[PDB]
Symmetry: D4
Subunit: 160 residues, 8 copies
Amino acid sequence: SAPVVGIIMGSQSDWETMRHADALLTELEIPHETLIVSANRTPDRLADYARTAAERGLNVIIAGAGGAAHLPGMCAAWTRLPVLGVPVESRALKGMDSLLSIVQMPGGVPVGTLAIGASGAKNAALLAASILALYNPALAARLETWRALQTASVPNSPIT
Amino acid sequence: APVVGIIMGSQSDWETMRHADALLTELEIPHETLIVSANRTPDRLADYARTAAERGLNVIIAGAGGAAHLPGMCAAWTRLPVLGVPVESRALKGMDSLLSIVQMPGGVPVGTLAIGASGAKNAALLAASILALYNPALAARLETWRALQTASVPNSPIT
Amino acid sequence: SAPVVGIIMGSQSDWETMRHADALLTELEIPHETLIVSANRTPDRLADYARTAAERGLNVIIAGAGGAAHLPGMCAAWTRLPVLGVPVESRALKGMDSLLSIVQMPGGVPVGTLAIGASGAKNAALLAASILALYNPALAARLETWRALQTASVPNSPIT
Amino acid sequence: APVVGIIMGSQSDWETMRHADALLTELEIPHETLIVSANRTPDRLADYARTAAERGLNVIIAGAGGAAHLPGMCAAWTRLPVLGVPVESRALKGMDSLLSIVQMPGGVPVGTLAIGASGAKNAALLAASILALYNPALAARLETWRALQTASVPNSPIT
Amino acid sequence: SAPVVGIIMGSQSDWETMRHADALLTELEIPHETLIVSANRTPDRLADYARTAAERGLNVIIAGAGGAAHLPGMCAAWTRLPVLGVPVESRALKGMDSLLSIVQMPGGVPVGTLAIGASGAKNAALLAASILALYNPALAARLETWRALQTASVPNSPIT
Amino acid sequence: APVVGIIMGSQSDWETMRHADALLTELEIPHETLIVSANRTPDRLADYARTAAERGLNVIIAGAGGAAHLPGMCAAWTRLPVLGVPVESRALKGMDSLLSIVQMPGGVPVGTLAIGASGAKNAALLAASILALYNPALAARLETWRALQTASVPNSPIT
Amino acid sequence: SAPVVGIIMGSQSDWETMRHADALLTELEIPHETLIVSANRTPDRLADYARTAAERGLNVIIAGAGGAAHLPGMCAAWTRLPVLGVPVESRALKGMDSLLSIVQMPGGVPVGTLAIGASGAKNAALLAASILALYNPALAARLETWRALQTASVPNSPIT
Amino acid sequence: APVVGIIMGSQSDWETMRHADALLTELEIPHETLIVSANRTPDRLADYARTAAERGLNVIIAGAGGAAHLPGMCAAWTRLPVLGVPVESRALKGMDSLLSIVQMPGGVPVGTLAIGASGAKNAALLAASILALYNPALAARLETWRALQTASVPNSPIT
């Protein structure tokens, strides 16, 4: 039952986006936890979350935030685990501030960044799954089936 | 046998992608380093990506610039995690590279790193952090690498 | 009755845009086919579509996609035919990701790119028509009439 | 007699547009290469574009930078397909060029290629692929060109 | 009664923006004409309009267009008169394509460019007025009064 | 006596604004060329702009880079037409300059020209075209200038 | 009762944004004044406001404006006080013109710039408070309590 | 004892941040100048920021480039005013730096200055203007500095 992925986000307003990561992990039967951790309002909460993640048994962190989106990169600063970043769409700049704040990490501290918005959340979960699948054969088979069905389900022509 | 594949769209990408190669070598991660063009050698890419898992690869690092299709198309054909490095382009400074890699639609992920050499280094570190989840000796070398990075930052600037 | 232009798009959600290409080809009496082909979900479908297009009698491909819009460029990778690309408008980045993903093809593999959105779809069809018109006199006359009427139909003053 | 016209807004565009000229010569496509400015020689452009078809041109490749009106205005006067090359500008690196060319409204197309030398080369290849539809010898030379490009990509980078 | 300013625009859809230039010229009692001239659909109409503007007694042209906005620059190519350009806001790119298509004229062929949208239309008319005011004392006094009243009419505090 | 004032925010702008100065001299338009900083010498700007008309100036050309307030603030204090030249900035290549100049709200216009040297040259030409409306000798020199520009464009590129 | 912070803005339309600065100063019991001052319509009003601010007892100016947003930088040109700038979101360019017009001040004349929109207004007030707190112990304690409560009030998980 | 802390993410930032250091020295403002990386030395940053007030610092000036988290994370841990300097980055010319610093959400401010050396100089001036509110001797030196800047602007450009 113990979580192997942590989904963290900067605010409740991020949940409309990050719920797509939660749903997909659940779909693939990946146990996980989902939390609010603010890089700017709760920096010590973040420090503790990230530095203890590995010893708590987490394998991957998915971090979502918008605007001056420091949460994924600061999480990666404190954990040796892979951290995946979801740029949450922002009001004025449409997530371009989110995206650049996350993806442009300096050499030495990676964040694997996904697309702005719900696509990115879904793909963070899928990327996490593909990481876990490397060591978990049952999950690898579920993921294979999932990817194959996605391919097989694309229609051949538009409803014109 | 290689467990990471580094692929890049052209020789011109090597100045950037060599940083990924160097990091993997530093951490003693067996890997292969190849040129594969999504646009000029699409069948080469198809074969590479579709057979990667069966050949024993665990992670693919793909770098390209401009209309950079290599990472996303690699991901389309493999179930393995694909990490993408936007190579800095001449006119648009890798913004075209970045958007063509990172903005993958839901269903086919590419874990995207920074534009340029930083991104190439970080793709290799991210690959390492993935492999470390099920390779304890590597996990310890990665811990050492991260600890040395942190400990080595000077406290004050030199003039 | 056999198609000489192929219209392909990455998803049903592209049809709201790509229908304008379909309508214009039909207006000019250009036989064509209209399909969904996903570069990221159905890469082998794309490979087969593009590599066989010429032998199937297609002369021009119009490819529409949004976001990380790889469909036109990957189509061009596998066919020797001219490929025309329509950047479909995306939600966050307003088709700028679509545009750059399509137009910035490296030297050696062209995609003739049109405007973001419905304008681009309409112009992909018109550009395809002007290509076909080079060898098809009846079509050339229909296109001449069409262009002339467009010019003649512009009003001289606004409804102020 | 020329079947492709290459036109460019100024001598400063030649460093970019020479790549189109070279490619057409390589594929033995007869063509003319001219300077025509939309803003400085608008009547020259009007005459060039309106008479292109009657002179036997099949495709026009137009390159310009900045507020780049040359391709679109060419297309306004000819029924021929017009391909546009955004020339890299000093300050905005061809983003002004790109948007002023690609964003043509419905009714007057310009098939737009990448910013810079890549775009110039690709405009010539796209013109070739158009002409190839009704010139079998050229179609075979184009097939050879594309096949050589694909076959010539190295498998691994050189240090 | 004869017009001294010409307002031209690429389409009826530009009128929602360009009407602000019309209104302001009328407010300041500047005789003018208002026309649709498309650079891309009616290039010969444009050529004739611009090359004859001076001999018809026009002193300033205000040209508004959106997207690949060639109308102001091509007008300036054919007239020696000052040409003022209004970037009409575009759907996807919010007038950034309009703006760059107008303002980035090469050395030798100026277009005096105003803000994206209605502000720009209003300011094109005001700029035209300030040009005409240089030789027309009655207009100069009307413009002085107008500018002074604008300054005097700014409130001192917000309605909080 | 000067009828055009060229003002610029700093000596660093001169490399750009000298093109305006040269063009006005070429057309024999009497003018003054000054440094006036909106941010460092705001009172100097206030006095310059408020007294420009009474001193006999007809047009002001104002160039600045970065957060470029000089043209707009000049326009705030004078009834004269103000033309603005966005000077290319180091990091953002004049996009900051452009937006801070062109986006004036309704009520206080600045006629804005291209980023850089092209814009400086064109501000002077636009000033000339304004003055030409009520100076026939100048109008004829401007006609000659435009005619020479058009006639001098080559027909084909040099290698 | 005398104001120690001045909030100025270019127009009534800025108030929807700048009210957040007003509210926060009032929340922290910081006396202040709130005015409309237009850099482009009332330049002499601005000159007088900024040059007399210090002698009137103001310690910090918060200046909000949009578009070609010159108000904060021109205020800073005339006062030795710290000036904080709020980029008000603009219609077409989403405050990017506002932001660049404010933040890119040349060396020698600072404006401390905050985020586009309401966030920036709120943070201008908070930044002003943190400046005043350096010399005002009661305010420093109120601000400490405010920051601590903000941190303590972040939820631990989303309402999923 | 220092009353301003200048912190920067790396030695590579020093070319930019030295301008802040120089200005503070010029105005005789005691300060410390340190390297602190948000991403490589997060615990160092935590300790620095949380203890700054108790150590007697009044203002922190933080400079970083790229995904620039240093100013915002500093502000997260201190009640002191934090001023942020976007360092110009190689590919995106500090636009990534700017947006990652300036776009702080309501509740945790960073007063942000221009990209590059101008921003570093202005962060130090802004810090000075803050300190001047409760240090009359400094206020007078700042007045002198601003007056000299204004008086020293030339009236006309040199060729």
